[PDB]
mmCIF file of C-alpha atoms in Angstrom:
data_model
loop_
_atom_site.group_PDB
_atom_site.id
_atom_site.type_symbol
_atom_site.label_atom_id
_atom_site.label_comp_id
_atom_site.label_asym_id
_atom_site.label_seq_id
_atom_site.Cartn_x
_atom_site.Cartn_y
_atom_site.Cartn_z
ATOM 1 C CA UNK I 51 -148.635 -5.948 -66.235
ATOM 2 C CA UNK I 52 -144.890 -5.516 -65.684
ATOM 3 C CA UNK I 53 -145.075 -6.591 -62.039
ATOM 4 C CA UNK I 54 -147.175 -9.648 -62.909
ATOM 5 C CA UNK I 55 -144.770 -10.661 -65.693
ATOM 6 C CA UNK I 56 -141.827 -10.415 -63.309
ATOM 7 C CA UNK I 57 -143.608 -12.505 -60.689
ATOM 8 C CA UNK I 58 -144.485 -15.192 -63.258
ATOM 9 C CA UNK I 59 -140.865 -15.432 -64.409
ATOM 10 C CA UNK I 60 -139.602 -15.664 -60.833
ATOM 11 C CA UNK I 61 -142.089 -18.405 -59.983
ATOM 12 C CA UNK I 62 -140.962 -20.439 -63.001
ATOM 13 C CA UNK I 63 -137.310 -20.101 -61.973
ATOM 14 C CA UNK I 64 -138.108 -21.230 -58.418
ATOM 15 C CA UNK I 65 -140.008 -24.210 -59.832
ATOM 16 C CA UNK I 66 -136.869 -25.289 -61.698
ATOM 17 C CA UNK I 67 -134.663 -24.747 -58.631
ATOM 18 C CA UNK I 68 -136.852 -27.104 -56.576
ATOM 19 C CA UNK I 69 -136.090 -30.201 -58.673
ATOM 20 C CA UNK I 70 -132.472 -29.096 -58.990
ATOM 21 C CA UNK I 71 -132.411 -29.352 -55.200
ATOM 22 C CA UNK I 72 -134.235 -32.675 -54.870
ATOM 23 C CA UNK I 73 -131.796 -34.619 -57.087
ATOM 24 C CA UNK I 74 -128.867 -34.032 -54.702
ATOM 25 C CA UNK I 75 -130.716 -35.414 -51.679
ATOM 26 C CA UNK I 76 -131.691 -38.492 -53.683
ATOM 27 C CA UNK I 77 -128.001 -39.127 -54.400
ATOM 28 C CA UNK I 78 -127.094 -38.645 -50.734
ATOM 29 C CA UNK I 79 -129.712 -41.115 -49.506
ATOM 30 C CA UNK I 80 -128.504 -43.706 -52.007
ATOM 31 C CA UNK I 81 -124.966 -43.438 -50.662
ATOM 32 C CA UNK I 82 -126.155 -43.627 -47.059
ATOM 33 C CA UNK I 83 -128.194 -46.743 -47.862
ATOM 34 C CA UNK I 84 -125.103 -48.479 -49.242
ATOM 35 C CA UNK I 85 -123.122 -47.622 -46.099
ATOM 36 C CA UNK I 86 -125.930 -48.875 -43.850
ATOM 37 C CA UNK I 87 -126.071 -52.132 -45.808
ATOM 38 C CA UNK I 88 -122.354 -52.712 -45.219
ATOM 39 C CA UNK I 89 -122.505 -51.966 -41.489
ATOM 40 C CA UNK I 90 -124.977 -54.759 -40.707
ATOM 41 C CA UNK I 91 -122.864 -57.433 -42.401
ATOM 42 C CA UNK I 92 -119.976 -56.170 -40.289
ATOM 43 C CA UNK I 93 -122.102 -56.595 -37.148
ATOM 44 C CA UNK I 94 -123.210 -60.091 -38.197
ATOM 45 C CA UNK I 95 -119.662 -61.299 -38.725
ATOM 46 C CA UNK I 96 -118.826 -59.613 -35.411
ATOM 47 C CA UNK I 97 -121.383 -61.678 -33.491
ATOM 48 C CA UNK I 98 -119.980 -64.696 -35.353
ATOM 49 C CA UNK I 99 -116.847 -64.609 -33.192
ATOM 50 C CA UNK I 100 -116.710 -64.837 -29.416
ATOM 51 C CA UNK D 2 -165.451 -13.997 -73.960
ATOM 52 C CA UNK D 3 -163.045 -15.205 -76.656
ATOM 53 C CA UNK D 4 -159.367 -14.254 -76.314
ATOM 54 C CA UNK D 5 -156.045 -15.287 -77.864
ATOM 55 C CA UNK D 6 -153.381 -17.072 -75.785
ATOM 56 C CA UNK D 7 -155.646 -17.689 -72.776
ATOM 57 C CA UNK D 8 -155.565 -21.502 -72.755
ATOM 58 C CA UNK D 9 -156.155 -21.881 -69.017
ATOM 59 C CA UNK D 10 -157.929 -25.279 -69.376
ATOM 60 C CA UNK D 11 -154.780 -26.557 -71.075
ATOM 61 C CA UNK D 12 -152.809 -25.543 -67.976
ATOM 62 C CA UNK D 13 -155.309 -27.284 -65.686
ATOM 63 C CA UNK D 14 -155.180 -30.481 -67.748
ATOM 64 C CA UNK D 15 -151.375 -30.380 -67.794
ATOM 65 C CA UNK D 16 -151.261 -30.068 -64.001
ATOM 66 C CA UNK D 17 -153.641 -32.984 -63.425
ATOM 67 C CA UNK D 18 -151.753 -35.098 -65.963
ATOM 68 C CA UNK D 19 -148.518 -34.363 -64.115
ATOM 69 C CA UNK D 20 -149.862 -35.611 -60.798
ATOM 70 C CA UNK D 21 -151.339 -38.702 -62.473
ATOM 71 C CA UNK D 22 -148.004 -39.566 -64.100
ATOM 72 C CA UNK D 23 -146.157 -39.150 -60.797
ATOM 73 C CA UNK D 24 -148.618 -41.489 -59.070
ATOM 74 C CA UNK D 25 -148.211 -44.079 -61.836
ATOM 75 C CA UNK D 26 -144.419 -43.926 -61.547
ATOM 76 C CA UNK D 27 -144.455 -44.410 -57.775
ATOM 77 C CA UNK D 28 -146.919 -47.312 -57.947
ATOM 78 C CA UNK D 29 -144.856 -49.055 -60.628
ATOM 79 C CA UNK D 30 -141.676 -48.627 -58.576
ATOM 80 C CA UNK D 31 -143.335 -50.011 -55.444
ATOM 81 C CA UNK D 32 -144.846 -53.083 -57.060
ATOM 82 C CA UNK D 33 -141.713 -53.898 -59.064
ATOM 83 C CA UNK D 34 -139.573 -53.618 -55.926
ATOM 84 C CA UNK D 35 -141.945 -55.754 -53.874
ATOM 85 C CA UNK D 36 -141.336 -53.637 -50.766
ATOM 86 C CA UNK D 37 -143.603 -51.266 -48.859
ATOM 87 C CA UNK D 38 -141.286 -48.547 -47.584
ATOM 88 C CA UNK D 39 -138.273 -48.438 -49.931
ATOM 89 C CA UNK D 40 -136.216 -45.211 -50.154
ATOM 90 C CA UNK D 41 -136.191 -43.352 -46.835
ATOM 91 C CA UNK D 42 -139.266 -41.085 -46.951
ATOM 92 C CA UNK D 43 -142.374 -43.302 -47.129
ATOM 93 C CA UNK D 44 -142.339 -44.089 -43.395
ATOM 94 C CA UNK D 45 -140.114 -42.347 -40.859
ATOM 95 C CA UNK D 46 -140.535 -44.828 -37.983
ATOM 96 C CA UNK D 47 -140.428 -48.342 -39.464
ATOM 97 C CA UNK D 48 -136.809 -48.202 -40.626
ATOM 98 C CA UNK D 49 -135.179 -48.412 -37.188
ATOM 99 C CA UNK D 50 -137.508 -51.217 -36.082
ATOM 100 C CA UNK U 745 -139.726 -62.476 -34.837
ATOM 101 C CA UNK U 746 -139.342 -63.292 -38.540
ATOM 102 C CA UNK U 747 -143.132 -63.517 -38.682
ATOM 103 C CA UNK U 748 -143.344 -60.143 -36.924
ATOM 104 C CA UNK U 749 -140.842 -58.436 -39.235
ATOM 105 C CA UNK U 750 -142.520 -59.724 -42.403
ATOM 106 C CA UNK U 751 -145.604 -57.593 -41.770
ATOM 107 C CA UNK U 752 -144.221 -54.382 -43.321
ATOM 108 C CA UNK U 753 -142.755 -56.167 -46.354
ATOM 109 C CA UNK U 754 -145.345 -55.352 -49.023
ATOM 110 C CA UNK U 755 -149.075 -54.864 -49.437
ATOM 111 C CA UNK U 756 -151.355 -57.711 -50.414
ATOM 112 C CA UNK U 757 -150.674 -57.460 -54.148
ATOM 113 C CA UNK U 758 -154.370 -57.106 -55.009
ATOM 114 C CA UNK U 759 -154.770 -53.540 -53.726
ATOM 115 C CA UNK U 760 -151.567 -52.325 -55.391
ATOM 116 C CA UNK U 761 -152.814 -53.882 -58.635
ATOM 117 C CA UNK U 762 -156.141 -52.082 -58.191
ATOM 118 C CA UNK U 763 -154.393 -48.738 -57.651
ATOM 119 C CA UNK U 764 -152.270 -49.318 -60.756
ATOM 120 C CA UNK U 765 -155.326 -50.209 -62.842
ATOM 121 C CA UNK U 766 -157.346 -47.193 -61.691
ATOM 122 C CA UNK U 767 -154.536 -44.703 -62.313
ATOM 123 C CA UNK U 768 -153.811 -46.238 -65.727
ATOM 124 C CA UNK U 769 -157.485 -45.890 -66.668
ATOM 125 C CA UNK U 770 -157.626 -42.262 -65.505
ATOM 126 C CA UNK U 771 -154.473 -41.135 -67.348
ATOM 127 C CA UNK U 772 -155.910 -41.798 -70.824
ATOM 128 C CA UNK U 773 -159.033 -39.774 -70.034
ATOM 129 C CA UNK U 774 -156.765 -36.912 -68.977
ATOM 130 C CA UNK U 775 -154.868 -37.152 -72.272
ATOM 131 C CA UNK U 776 -158.018 -37.188 -74.421
ATOM 132 C CA UNK U 777 -159.525 -34.212 -72.593
ATOM 133 C CA UNK U 778 -156.249 -32.317 -72.996
ATOM 134 C CA UNK U 779 -156.325 -33.003 -76.737
ATOM 135 C CA UNK U 780 -159.866 -31.670 -77.105
ATOM 136 C CA UNK U 781 -159.061 -28.630 -74.946
ATOM 137 C CA UNK U 782 -156.146 -27.821 -77.241
ATOM 138 C CA UNK U 783 -158.362 -28.323 -80.293
ATOM 139 C CA UNK U 784 -161.494 -26.332 -79.545
ATOM 140 C CA UNK U 785 -161.154 -22.618 -78.705
ATOM 141 C CA UNK U 786 -158.605 -21.357 -81.230
ATOM 142 C CA UNK U 787 -160.377 -23.129 -84.086
ATOM 143 C CA UNK U 788 -163.678 -21.630 -82.924
ATOM 144 C CA UNK U 789 -162.190 -18.129 -82.831
ATOM 145 C CA UNK U 790 -160.570 -18.553 -86.253
ATOM 146 C CA UNK U 791 -163.994 -19.567 -87.550
ATOM 147 C CA UNK U 792 -165.371 -16.339 -86.066
ATOM 148 C CA UNK U 793 -162.721 -14.160 -87.726
ATOM 149 C CA UNK V 745 -127.202 -39.126 -62.165
ATOM 150 C CA UNK V 746 -128.893 -40.288 -65.378
ATOM 151 C CA UNK V 747 -132.242 -39.395 -63.815
ATOM 152 C CA UNK V 748 -131.054 -35.954 -62.692
ATOM 153 C CA UNK V 749 -129.314 -35.067 -65.962
ATOM 154 C CA UNK V 750 -132.324 -35.933 -68.118
ATOM 155 C CA UNK V 751 -134.401 -33.079 -66.708
ATOM 156 C CA UNK V 752 -132.940 -30.385 -69.000
ATOM 157 C CA UNK V 753 -133.382 -32.296 -72.266
ATOM 158 C CA UNK V 754 -136.911 -31.603 -73.498
ATOM 159 C CA UNK V 755 -140.103 -30.049 -72.186
ATOM 160 C CA UNK V 756 -143.466 -31.735 -72.052
ATOM 161 C CA UNK V 757 -144.801 -32.258 -75.557
ATOM 162 C CA UNK V 758 -148.099 -30.735 -74.404
ATOM 163 C CA UNK V 759 -147.073 -27.105 -73.902
ATOM 164 C CA UNK V 760 -144.830 -27.066 -76.977
ATOM 165 C CA UNK V 761 -147.718 -28.383 -79.080
ATOM 166 C CA UNK V 762 -149.977 -25.760 -77.497
ATOM 167 C CA UNK V 763 -147.582 -22.940 -78.411
ATOM 168 C CA UNK V 764 -147.281 -24.351 -81.932
ATOM 169 C CA UNK V 765 -151.055 -24.375 -82.422
ATOM 170 C CA UNK V 766 -151.513 -20.906 -80.920
ATOM 171 C CA UNK V 767 -148.913 -19.299 -83.189
ATOM 172 C CA UNK V 768 -150.321 -21.197 -86.179
ATOM 173 C CA UNK V 769 -153.766 -19.743 -85.463
ATOM 174 C CA UNK V 770 -152.511 -16.187 -84.939
ATOM 175 C CA UNK V 771 -150.378 -16.079 -88.107
ATOM 176 C CA UNK V 772 -153.440 -16.520 -90.336
ATOM 177 C CA UNK V 773 -155.199 -13.553 -88.715
ATOM 178 C CA UNK V 774 -152.042 -11.501 -89.252
ATOM 179 C CA UNK V 775 -151.998 -12.438 -92.944
ATOM 180 C CA UNK V 776 -155.694 -11.700 -93.478
ATOM 181 C CA UNK V 777 -155.438 -8.277 -91.841
ATOM 182 C CA UNK V 778 -152.338 -7.520 -93.908
ATOM 183 C CA UNK V 779 -154.263 -8.371 -97.080
ATOM 184 C CA UNK V 780 -157.238 -6.188 -96.173
ATOM 185 C CA UNK V 781 -154.993 -3.290 -95.124
ATOM 186 C CA UNK V 782 -153.119 -3.544 -98.426
ATOM 187 C CA UNK V 783 -156.387 -3.478 -100.378
ATOM 188 C CA UNK V 784 -157.676 -0.532 -98.315
ATOM 189 C CA UNK V 785 -155.950 2.727 -99.334
ATOM 190 C CA UNK V 786 -156.070 3.371 -103.082
ATOM 191 C CA UNK V 787 -159.401 1.662 -103.785
ATOM 192 C CA UNK V 788 -161.165 4.031 -101.372
ATOM 193 C CA UNK V 789 -159.353 7.045 -102.884
ATOM 194 C CA UNK V 790 -159.418 6.552 -106.664
ATOM 195 C CA UNK V 791 -163.090 7.632 -106.768
ATOM 196 C CA UNK V 792 -162.352 11.091 -105.332
ATOM 197 C CA UNK V 793 -161.676 12.318 -108.871
ATOM 198 C CA UNK A 2 -144.858 -33.625 -67.010
ATOM 199 C CA UNK A 3 -144.388 -36.238 -69.739
ATOM 200 C CA UNK A 4 -140.964 -36.676 -71.322
ATOM 201 C CA UNK A 5 -139.232 -38.683 -74.038
ATOM 202 C CA UNK A 6 -135.821 -40.390 -73.741
ATOM 203 C CA UNK A 7 -136.477 -40.699 -70.004
ATOM 204 C CA UNK A 8 -137.332 -44.370 -69.390
ATOM 205 C CA UNK A 9 -136.079 -44.670 -65.808
ATOM 206 C CA UNK A 10 -138.541 -47.358 -64.560
ATOM 207 C CA UNK A 11 -137.054 -49.659 -67.186
ATOM 208 C CA UNK A 12 -133.615 -49.054 -65.665
ATOM 209 C CA UNK A 13 -134.813 -49.743 -62.117
ATOM 210 C CA UNK A 14 -136.653 -52.911 -63.158
ATOM 211 C CA UNK A 15 -133.545 -54.068 -65.029
ATOM 212 C CA UNK A 16 -131.446 -53.579 -61.896
ATOM 213 C CA UNK A 17 -133.847 -55.503 -59.651
ATOM 214 C CA UNK A 18 -134.127 -58.281 -62.235
ATOM 215 C CA UNK A 19 -130.337 -58.406 -62.091
ATOM 216 C CA UNK A 20 -130.257 -59.053 -58.354
ATOM 217 C CA UNK A 21 -133.059 -61.619 -58.649
ATOM 218 C CA UNK A 22 -131.295 -63.562 -61.405
ATOM 219 C CA UNK A 23 -127.933 -63.500 -59.621
ATOM 220 C CA UNK A 24 -129.534 -64.872 -56.447
ATOM 221 C CA UNK A 25 -131.304 -67.582 -58.460
ATOM 222 C CA UNK A 26 -128.026 -68.642 -60.077
ATOM 223 C CA UNK A 27 -126.231 -68.756 -56.729
ATOM 224 C CA UNK A 28 -128.940 -70.916 -55.130
ATOM 225 C CA UNK A 29 -128.945 -73.209 -58.169
ATOM 226 C CA UNK A 30 -125.177 -73.639 -57.803
ATOM 227 C CA UNK A 31 -125.450 -74.371 -54.078
ATOM 228 C CA UNK A 32 -128.198 -76.972 -54.325
ATOM 229 C CA UNK A 33 -126.655 -78.688 -57.358
ATOM 230 C CA UNK A 34 -123.323 -78.932 -55.532
ATOM 231 C CA UNK A 35 -124.929 -80.232 -52.352
ATOM 232 C CA UNK A 36 -122.234 -78.562 -50.249
ATOM 233 C CA UNK A 37 -122.698 -75.630 -47.884
ATOM 234 C CA UNK A 38 -119.406 -73.804 -48.301
ATOM 235 C CA UNK A 39 -118.177 -74.246 -51.905
ATOM 236 C CA UNK A 40 -115.669 -71.782 -53.435
ATOM 237 C CA UNK A 41 -113.674 -69.825 -50.852
ATOM 238 C CA UNK A 42 -115.707 -66.645 -50.251
ATOM 239 C CA UNK A 43 -118.957 -67.714 -48.557
ATOM 240 C CA UNK A 44 -117.292 -68.345 -45.180
ATOM 241 C CA UNK A 45 -113.743 -67.389 -44.220
ATOM 242 C CA UNK A 46 -113.410 -69.634 -41.150
ATOM 243 C CA UNK A 47 -114.942 -73.001 -42.070
ATOM 244 C CA UNK A 48 -112.246 -73.950 -44.580
ATOM 245 C CA UNK A 49 -109.429 -74.448 -42.063
ATOM 246 C CA UNK A 50 -111.618 -76.314 -39.566
ATOM 247 C CA UNK H 745 -112.464 -69.091 -69.055
ATOM 248 C CA UNK H 746 -115.778 -69.847 -70.769
ATOM 249 C CA UNK H 747 -117.458 -67.810 -68.027
ATOM 250 C CA UNK H 748 -114.926 -64.988 -68.397
ATOM 251 C CA UNK H 749 -114.979 -64.885 -72.207
ATOM 252 C CA UNK H 750 -118.739 -64.775 -72.708
ATOM 253 C CA UNK H 751 -119.139 -61.668 -70.618
ATOM 254 C CA UNK H 752 -118.291 -59.781 -73.838
ATOM 255 C CA UNK H 753 -120.810 -61.385 -76.215
ATOM 256 C CA UNK H 754 -124.037 -59.386 -75.956
ATOM 257 C CA UNK H 755 -125.900 -57.058 -73.629
ATOM 258 C CA UNK H 756 -129.119 -57.913 -71.873
ATOM 259 C CA UNK H 757 -131.984 -58.057 -74.347
ATOM 260 C CA UNK H 758 -133.943 -55.657 -72.122
ATOM 261 C CA UNK H 759 -131.958 -52.500 -72.878
ATOM 262 C CA UNK H 760 -131.749 -53.355 -76.584
ATOM 263 C CA UNK H 761 -135.543 -53.655 -76.636
ATOM 264 C CA UNK H 762 -135.820 -50.348 -74.765
ATOM 265 C CA UNK H 763 -133.639 -48.464 -77.262
ATOM 266 C CA UNK H 764 -135.463 -50.095 -80.176
ATOM 267 C CA UNK H 765 -138.888 -49.016 -78.905
ATOM 268 C CA UNK H 766 -137.552 -45.537 -78.085
ATOM 269 C CA UNK H 767 -136.112 -44.911 -81.549
ATOM 270 C CA UNK H 768 -139.064 -46.474 -83.369
ATOM 271 C CA UNK H 769 -141.550 -44.282 -81.504
ATOM 272 C CA UNK H 770 -139.450 -41.156 -82.093
ATOM 273 C CA UNK H 771 -139.237 -41.794 -85.859
ATOM 274 C CA UNK H 772 -143.004 -41.354 -86.274
ATOM 275 C CA UNK H 773 -142.859 -37.939 -84.599
ATOM 276 C CA UNK H 774 -140.054 -36.986 -86.982
ATOM 277 C CA UNK H 775 -142.161 -38.036 -89.979
ATOM 278 C CA UNK H 776 -145.268 -36.171 -88.811
ATOM 279 C CA UNK H 777 -143.355 -32.960 -88.103
ATOM 280 C CA UNK H 778 -141.635 -33.172 -91.490
ATOM 281 C CA UNK H 779 -145.034 -33.570 -93.163
ATOM 282 C CA UNK H 780 -146.412 -30.481 -91.418
ATOM 283 C CA UNK H 781 -143.256 -28.512 -92.245
ATOM 284 C CA UNK H 782 -143.640 -29.340 -95.937
ATOM 285 C CA UNK H 783 -147.341 -28.490 -95.734
ATOM 286 C CA UNK H 784 -146.904 -25.011 -94.248
ATOM 287 C CA UNK H 785 -144.830 -22.866 -96.668
ATOM 288 C CA UNK H 786 -146.604 -22.398 -100.002
ATOM 289 C CA UNK H 787 -150.174 -22.835 -98.758
ATOM 290 C CA UNK H 788 -149.548 -19.910 -96.394
ATOM 291 C CA UNK H 789 -148.342 -17.626 -99.213
ATOM 292 C CA UNK H 790 -150.729 -18.598 -102.020
ATOM 293 C CA UNK H 791 -153.475 -16.422 -100.489
ATOM 294 C CA UNK H 792 -151.336 -13.273 -100.348
ATOM 295 C CA UNK H 793 -152.228 -12.589 -103.984
#
């Protein structure tokens, strides 16, 4: 009983940690998307000249 | 066998409800956005093309 | 090329609508079954006691 | 950030309601057994003499 | 897992509606004016020429 | 200046509607829980003796 209780508690804590982790990557991909959006306008106005 | 605090079917229903809600959220996001891929994880090969 | 690129834009709206409708229908059944699962066993046992 | 922060605000209503119902059921059994235990001792002894 | 006080799809839809409405207003301005450039920000090089 | 000034008149109606629905739906839960809380105390002690 004691071992099973400990395992249940640990599994719950890991379940929380998973979403705690996922939020950070979501933020990172948002920032990267903004940067990628800017870079293409730079390239377009680059091919403008010449 | 009748016990107390053994509501396993409640746990099963909660799990299935969770997956259903996640699917609803993703479908609503997709159709509101009007895009297939969105984000960066739906397709790993179409973004570069 | 603009015809070629606009082939990964979005699904033909009909199938996305169908997915939305089916999931929306299924969620309420999940909720009702969860309610009855919460209701039944403890009341039955308290009747036994 | 507003999505991430609002994941430590409240649980699902389902499991909280489940716990509420389970404790509500068990308290009544506690009370009934307390009543019978209280009635037990002296009534079964006063006829000894 | 259902929540309360967690209406994020509303926020996302509000954002996308914002971009849609801003684009509509800009196109309305352009066609009503009947001029390509307008303002001073759309193109940085056509003004001098 | 009429564009600049009336950026401080009112929000979008969307978020106001969202908060209104949120608070209105939470009030009913408050009322129901208050009713159950008033129901519990004396009915649970009247059968002690």
